[PDB]
Design a protein around this ligand. Structure first.
Ligand SMILES: CCCCCCCCCCC[C@H](O)CC(=O)SCCNC(=O)CCNC(=O)[C@H](O)C(C)(C)COP(=O)(O)O
Ligand code: SF4
Ligand code: SF4
Ligand code: SF4
Ligand code: SF4
Ligand code: FES
Ligand SMILES: [K+]
Ligand SMILES: [Zn+2]
Lengths: 87, 115, 129, 119, 699, 96, 209, 48
């Protein structure tokens, strides 16, 4: 089983490479959380880190979609792509 | 900064050259050394132990370093040839008395806090 | 500025194969580069000016006899001193030792005034002297 | 001579209480690190060593311990005939050393009585 | 432009105007000898050793108090200064007692060392020395007052960094004695620090008293885990044993002090320890057994039982490496009930946004704020170093605190706003007068204690304070970088546990009763065998067997915080690491290696196999758990605020009562503290009078 | 004096005595466990408490240079006695 | 005398040594980097490593130097420097009744021209330097270990080599031969950090960086 | 000692012992200090 357990977003605070995800999170993150209140979206940020997405699936599986330099629309389109499959 | 004068070898090619006949000088006398020192071990395990010692020093990629082991091995050959090392010194290469330290993580966790 | 059959030796210094250290004590040891903090009991600072190199501690059991603190790690009392972090951090991997480095803690300058002890308004006025 | 350095011993005051107050000066100055000391608050207050071991096979008999001692507690007695058959019998602890102090006291007291003025 | 220029020993030095001579000398590197002058405390002048000669000036000035001006050549090594130093020390050593062989300060005594460097080599004092009767100030502080030099460092510390005024100087002349006149214990969370500031052996530590010598102990830096402040300490170890925990210097986290629970708690690490695995026999009695048998039994129950019937209530003292190792193990079993004893409100953003659960404004930021608001917390005991920082900011910056919890002693003086939780809503609406104060304050600060969140209405309180921050954030009186909302935690493994993704609180365990519950260092006793379903498998991996040990079957001896190279995150977000001071006793092993070895036996072997590997895995889960000694500033407070607007939880009439109101319950908090013997004397001392704590203390 | 242990072994003044289940006992068989009998903890108690009519005293352990370094004890607290740290001899002001 | 404890200081020797120090410095500016006379009238000459042979030859053969006896040849291992090893020469001039110190520098991997040609006494001193520290010397006749046991690993006097060593010895009865094992001390060497945190000598106060 | 006997004190032995090496009266070295780590005592109660 690969049902969605948690989504981890690692973004840099000021790096232009992680600028796009910052544009996403101020606007669209709240609406995403209202859609999946049970889903633990993790936004553990850092400094000088390549903006990446970790998606923990059931039975201990983790995908490593990397949203480097992705714009806010790109970040959102990656998100619904990951959670499009309920399993 | 990136350039410093060498020991004997100007690059890896001649440094590797000085390794080869050192291995040659180490291959030939192993049966003679075994005969000389009344080695319990046969000739065969003598030859690959020379091979294995030469093998473990393979990651070296610096002409100055390779010269240092080359000259150091030469002294080791010299010490062995003119009966300067006794049986105990020769048997030191064969780690016999000490028990095999296991390599799996589970065994290490069972025996102690060794990382 | 020295013509002594100079050749390009770009690759990093790897003298580890010559120091004679056994294989165990060359990877599984994590050295620490740090400026020792002043002994809080004292107030002098003459022991916090040189970078120190030390090896992580290991098992220390008790003898079946009277019971000293036995050990089996030779790299237990080895402490090295370096005058600059760069020299210290360079000696680690040159000898081939995994390291972690802690930056020097400089006591920040604090403005101190004796007249503040007796302040007309501020609560810094002391009640005893 | 009265200055002779031999088997070690801990002496005690004329009252009976030991002289060692566990300042670890003897352990700190021992050139061969043959001294091991562990101290702990005694039941009555004033506290002494709970472990005072001298490694007589590691000792160099330099006498530095008896100089460092500010209370003349650890001294090197006049005995030099404590040869033993087993290595472990040499490794003295507090009890054996205290026994030596209660055995060679009649001699060590006189030696320091004749030599204290020189020091 | 203001920088005036001075000549320290002739060499030109640029100094800020108002700088004392002593700091100017320190700029070159020369350290003027001193006794009374401690950098943190005020400047007094009783020392008289900081005396130095100013060029073309006939009078020797006191470098501890004289502010320099234009063109001064501070002749540090001038002859007149050297004669002055010898004279002053001659007076100091005139009446000092001959206690060096029996004084604990021996080997690290400033009076001893300064005598070797700046002092004569004999004495010309053929008189009778003075003797002063000893005083008792508690079962923690050795007081041999005959050795005191009246530097008044202890007096200054008590009245400045401690806040309690009980240490003073009585009498005049040579007969003047520093003490407390009427017999009374000097008790505070920072009481033990007077041992450090005292330059002589007049004030030393009773628990460690004359058990070791400074030249023979090996000092190992580490991070304290007793509290959530994460104070840096120097654990001194000799012959594989722990004697002293000395404070380190960080200038941000703990300055130069530690709490008493931080200092006098090593005795707990040597009592009531778990050293061998335990499995219940045919009579259900935990007996000694090998590691393989213990791991085999746990692995079998873990393999057979999967899904959500496996859980893990991680304790408050665990490390980040152990937390992630258990997280990975139970994730491979599909268990997502990784719980922690501390209950943080999961409603709204919860653990998602890092800014929700943090001291965003950092500890050092307290000295910059002007108005603080503590909500339902007692920082004097929940985080003693944080309270000291508040007092330090209170003293100098004239910062005005304000409390909404119960009226408790906080050293400084606050203005109680009532203990009713409804006060929070009034401030949000602006009806309460303090709401206006928060608008005018340039850098307002709001701190909510994690103990308040332990209540049933924790979500409502969090929503209330977040509305408080929003109300004053909309007003432009606050700067952009100023982070108002702040959460002060109590247990150590809470920021790290919540950062990793552990579900805050324990509600998932009772709402979905598991049968393979993993008690990882859990000792708060939040979950018992009754709430768990019948025939529950309990695995305890602690170091002390206090509460979580008896209610288990497969006890696994773990490693203490002084026996592992862990990664603890303080309540401000800084992720610091400890170092192995001494190996765990007996057969007890490191926590993360235990879980990794258990996973290998169970079949689902974890990827990481070394400390670097698990730390790298820690980086993958949260990159800020590797950035040691670096506060990774969070953001998106508005997004957390908007989510808290969703759902509606109402307040209650129960007043905000902190769990610790007085000193007596500050001592007995955690497993190490509970198992400690020296700590039991302290709680015994504060409960009854002085007569119950005294020993023949002489050396 | 010396107290015997329940297992039948003399207990040293430090309180050391091997447990019944302790394996490190075979050494003592066919030998003798060295222990001193003059327990300094006890012998110091028999010393009479000296009474002097002065606020402070000077104790050197007797013998001058042969004793411990000279210390000065403050016999002011009439509740209890003042004991020299080095040697343990007590002193007391007679009703001050 | 007003200094019954302070060791008397000679200025005439200081002037003579200083004058000779300038003399040698001008003679061979190709290698002499810096020269200093210590407070207790001892002269040290800091040469470049390539000048090991020419400088020694000049001091040995010049009519105004005649330093014709190598007292000892040792090195000081200072890890904090780029060239950790620091080879030191000590020469004595019988004709002029004076001693000189000639010191070079060398990293781990660099060969030094053996002074066996100039001073045949250096021959055995060279082997000790290589054995204790690891400094290889080119053109040495019989460069080999001199003090350490046969088949010894590492160089003991290096500051990064533990005092107790890596291997101890024991007679193993199973093989009926003395064998080597990893070291296991009955009592570990109790290291003593006994450096006072208070400045000792203001004269050598290194300026801050 | 007949002309000048040494000063007499209580702790001084009244019977000299020769070298007791070899005979079953030797000195066997042993630890003079107590234990350091107190093992947690399991509860004998049958729990549950
Ligand atoms: C008789 C009783 C005792 C019996 C026991 C005796 C054991 C000791 C004998 C002496 C051993 C000797 O010291 C070894 C030394 O000096 S150096 C080893 C080879 N290390 C290098 O040469 C460095 C560079 N490495 C390479 O060049 C490549 O690894 C390789 C060699 C494979 C060629 O590669 P190519 O082909 O690309
Ligand atoms: S005489 Fe022996 S015990 Fe005393 S200091 Fe010297 S080596 Fe140590
Ligand atoms: S020097 Fe004397 S008083 Fe100090 S510890 Fe040693 S025996 Fe005891
Ligand atoms: S405080 Fe202790 S060490 Fe310092 S001078 Fe006084 S007795 Fe000596
Ligand atoms: S007790 Fe210590 S800190 Fe207090 S005045 Fe005396 S010397 Fe200073
Ligand atoms: S330092 Fe200024 S008087 Fe003590
Ligand atoms: K002190
Ligand atoms: Zn006395």
């Amino acid at each position: 089983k690969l049902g969605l357990r948690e989504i981890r977003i690692h973004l840099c605070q000021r790096s232009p490479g992680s600028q796009g995800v910052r544009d996403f999170i101020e606007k669209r993150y709240v609406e995403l959380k209202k859609a999946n209140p049970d889903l633990p979206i993790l936004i553990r940020e850092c400094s000088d880190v390549q903006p990446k997405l970790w998606a923990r699936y059931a039975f201990g599986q983790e995908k490593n979609v990397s949203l480097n330099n992705f714009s806010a629309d790109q970040v959102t389109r990656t998100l619904e792509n990951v959670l499009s499959g309920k399993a | 900064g990136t350039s410093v004068k060498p020991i004997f070898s100007r690059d890896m090619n001649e440094a590797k050259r000085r390794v080869r006949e050192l291995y040659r000088a180490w291959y030939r006398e192993v049966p003679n050394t075994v005969h000389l020192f009344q080695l319990d071990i046969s000739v065969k395990q003598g030859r690959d132990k020379v091979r294995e010692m030469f093998m473990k020093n393979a990651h070296v990629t610096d002409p100055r370093v390779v010269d240092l082991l080359v000259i150091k091995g030469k002294m080791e050959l010299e010490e062995t040839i003119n009966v300067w090392k006794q049986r105990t010194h020769i048997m030191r290469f064969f780690h016999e008395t000490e028990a095999p330290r296991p390599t799996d993580f589970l065994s290490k966790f069972y025996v102690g806090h060794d990382p | 500025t020295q013509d002594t059959q100079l050749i390009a030796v770009d690759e990093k210094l790897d003298i580890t194969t010559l120091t004679g250290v056994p294989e165990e004590h060359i990877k599984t040891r994590k050295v620490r580069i740090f400026v020792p903090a002043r002994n809080n009991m004292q107030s002098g600072v003459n022991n916090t000016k040189k970078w120190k190199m030390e090896f992580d501690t290991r098992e220390r059991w008790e003898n079946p006899l009277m019971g000293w603190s036995s050990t089996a790690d030779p790299l237990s009392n080895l402490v090295l001193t370096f005058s600059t972090k760069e020299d210290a951090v360079a000696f680690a991997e040159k000898n081939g030792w995994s390291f972690d480095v802690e930056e020097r803690k400089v006591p920040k300058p604090k403005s101190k005034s004796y007249g503040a002890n007796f302040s007309w308004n501020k609560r810094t006025r002391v009640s005893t002297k | 001579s009265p200055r002779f350095r031999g088997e070690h011993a801990l002496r005690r005051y004329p009252s009976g209480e030991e002289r060692c107050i566990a300042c670890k000066l003897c352990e700190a100055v021992c050139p061969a690190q043959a001294i091991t000391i562990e101290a702990e608050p005694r039941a009555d207050g004033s506290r002494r060593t709970t472990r005072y071991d001298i490694d007589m096979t590691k000792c160099i008999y330099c006498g530095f311990c008896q100089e460092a001692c500010p209370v003349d507690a650890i001294v090197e007695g006049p005995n030099f005939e404590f040869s033993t058959e087993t290595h472990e019998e040499l490794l003295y602890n507090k009890e054996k050393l205290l026994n030596n102090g209660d055995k060679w006291e009649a001699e060590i007291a006189a030696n320091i009585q004749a030599d204290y003025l020189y020091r | 432009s203001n920088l005036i220029e001075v000549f320290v020993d002739g060499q030109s030095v640029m100094v800020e105007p108002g700088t004392t001579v002593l700091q100017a000398c320190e700029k070159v590197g020369m350290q003027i000898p001193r006794f009374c002058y401690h950098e943190r405390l005020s400047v007094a002048g009783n020392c008289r050793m900081c005396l130095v000669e100013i060029e073309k000036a006939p009078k020797v000035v006191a470098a501890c108090a004289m502010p320099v001006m234009k063109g001064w050549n501070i002749l540090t090594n001038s002859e007149k200064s050297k004669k002055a130093r010898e004279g002053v020390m001659e007076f100091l050593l005139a009446n000092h007692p001959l206690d060096c062989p029996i004084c604990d300060q021996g080997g690290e005594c400033d009076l001893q060392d300064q005598s070797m460097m700046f002092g004569s080599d004999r004495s010309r004092f053929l008189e009778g020395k003075r003797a002063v009767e000893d005083k008792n100030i508690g079962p923690l502080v050795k007081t041999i007052m005959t050795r005191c030099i009246q530097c008044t460092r202890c007096i200054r510390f008590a009245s400045e960094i401690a806040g309690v005024d009980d240490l003073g100087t009585t009498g005049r002349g040579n007969d003047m004695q520093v003490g407390t006149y009427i017999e009374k214990m000097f008790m505070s969370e920072l009481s033990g620090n007077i041992i450090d500031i005292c330059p002589v052996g007049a004030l030393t530590s009773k628990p460690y008293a004359f058990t070791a010598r400074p030249w023979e102990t090996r000092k190992t830096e580490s991070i304290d885990v007793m509290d959530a402040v994460g104070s840096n300490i120097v654990v001194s170890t000799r012959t594989g044993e722990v004697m002293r925990i000395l404070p380190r210097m960080h200038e941000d986290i703990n300055e130069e002090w530690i709490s008493d629970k931080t200092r006098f708690a090593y005795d707990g690490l040597k009592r009531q320890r778990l050293t061998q695995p335990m499995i219940r026999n045919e009579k259900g009695l935990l007996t000694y057994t090998t590691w393989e048998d213990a791991l085999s039994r746990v692995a079998g129950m873990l393999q057979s039982f999967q899904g959500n019937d496996v859980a893990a209530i991680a304790g408050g003292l665990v490390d980040a490496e152990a937390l992630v190792a258990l997280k990975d193990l139970l994730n491979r079993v599909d268990s997502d009930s990784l719980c922690t004893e501390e209950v943080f409100p999961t409603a709204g953003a919860g653990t998602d946004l890092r800014s929700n659960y943090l001291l965003n404004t950092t500890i050092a930021g307290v000295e910059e704020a002007d108005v603080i608001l503590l909500v339902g917390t007692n920082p004097r005991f929940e985080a003693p170093l944080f309270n000291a920082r508040i007092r330090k900011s209170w003293l100098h910056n004239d910062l005005k605190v304000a409390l909404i919890g119960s009226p408790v002693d906080l050293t400084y003086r606050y203005d109680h706003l009532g203990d009713s939780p409804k006060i929070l809503q009034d401030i949000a609406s602006g009806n309460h007068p303090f709401s206006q104060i928060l608008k005018e304050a340039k850098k307002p600060m709001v701190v909510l204690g994690s103990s308040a969140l332990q209540r049933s209405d924790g979500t409502a309180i969090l929503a209330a304070v977040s509305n408080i921050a929003q109300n004053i954030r909309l007003s432009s009186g606050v700067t952009g970088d100023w982070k108002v909302m702040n959460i002060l935690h109590r247990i150590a493994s809470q920021v790290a546990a919540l950062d990793l993704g552990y579900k805050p609180g324990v509600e998932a365990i009772r709402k979905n009763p598991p049968k393979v519950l993993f008690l990882l260092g859990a000792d708060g006793g939040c979950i018992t065998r009754q709430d768990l379903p019948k025939d529950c498998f309990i695995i305890y991996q602690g170091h002390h067997g206090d509460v979580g040990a008896p209610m288990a079957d497969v006890i696994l001896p773990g490693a203490a915080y002084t026996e592992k190279s862990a990664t603890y995150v303080n309540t401000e977000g800084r992720a610091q690491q400890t170092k192995v001071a001494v190996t765990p006793p007996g057969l007890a092993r490191e926590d993360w290696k235990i879980i990794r070895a258990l996973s290998e036996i169970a079949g689902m072997t974890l990827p990481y196999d070394t400390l670097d590997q698990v730390r790298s895995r820690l980086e993958e889960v949260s990159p800020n758990l590797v950035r040691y000694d670096d506060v990774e500033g969070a953001n998106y407070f508005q997004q957390a605020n908007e989510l808290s607007k969703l759902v509606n939880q109402q307040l209650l009439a129960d007043p905000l009562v902190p769990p610790q109101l007085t000193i007596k319950d500050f001592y007995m908090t955690d497993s190490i503290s509970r198992a400690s013997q020296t700590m039991a004397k302290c709680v015994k001392a504060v409960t009854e009078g002085i007569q119950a704590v005294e020993e023949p203390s002489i050396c | 004096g010396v107290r015997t242990s329940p297992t039948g072994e003399k207990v040293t003044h430090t309180g050391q005595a091997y447990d019944d289940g302790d394996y490190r006992r075979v050494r003592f068989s066919d030998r003798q466990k060295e222990v001193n009998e003059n327990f300094a903890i006890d012998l110091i108690a028999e010393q009479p408490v000296s009474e002097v009519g002065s606020r402070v005293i000077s104790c050197d352990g007797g013998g001058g240079a042969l004793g411990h370094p000279r210390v000065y004890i403050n016999l002011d607290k009439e509740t209890k006695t003042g004991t020299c740290g080095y040697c343990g001899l007590q002193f007391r002001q007679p009703h001050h | 005398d007003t200094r019954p404890t302070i060791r008397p200081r000679n200025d005439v020797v200081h002037k003579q040594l200083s004058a000779f120090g300038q003399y040698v410095a001008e003679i061979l500016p190709k290698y002499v980097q810096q020269v200093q006379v210590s407070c207790f009238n001892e002269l040290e000459i800091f040469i470049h490593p390539d000048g090991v042979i020419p400088v020694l030859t000049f001091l040995r053969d010049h009519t105004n130097a005649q330093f014709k006896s190598l007292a000892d040849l040792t090195a000081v291992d200072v890890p904090t420097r780029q060239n950790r090893f620091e080879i030191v020469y000590n020469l004595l001039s019988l004709r002029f009744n004076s001693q000189i110190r000639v010191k070079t520098y060398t990293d781990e991997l660099t060969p030094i021209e053996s002074s066996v040609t100039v001073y045949k006494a250096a021959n055995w001193y060279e082997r000790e330097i290589w054995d204790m520290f690891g400094v290889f010397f080119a053109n040495h006749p019989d460069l080999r270990r001199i003090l350490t046991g046969y088949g010894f690993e590492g160089h003991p006097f290096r500051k990064d080599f533990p005092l107790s060593g890596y291997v101890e010895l024991r007679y193993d009865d199973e093989v009926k031969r003395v064998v080597a094992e990893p070291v296991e001390l009955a009592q570990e060497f109790r290291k003593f950090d006994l450096n006072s945190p208070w400045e000792a000598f203001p004269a050598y106060r290194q300026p801050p960086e | 000692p007949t002309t000048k006997p040494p000063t007499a004190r209580k702790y001084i032995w009244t019977n000299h012992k020769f070298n007791v090496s070899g005979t079953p009266q030797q000195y066997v070295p042993y630890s003079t200090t107590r234990k350091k780590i107190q093992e947690w005592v399991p509860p004998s109660t049958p729990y549950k």
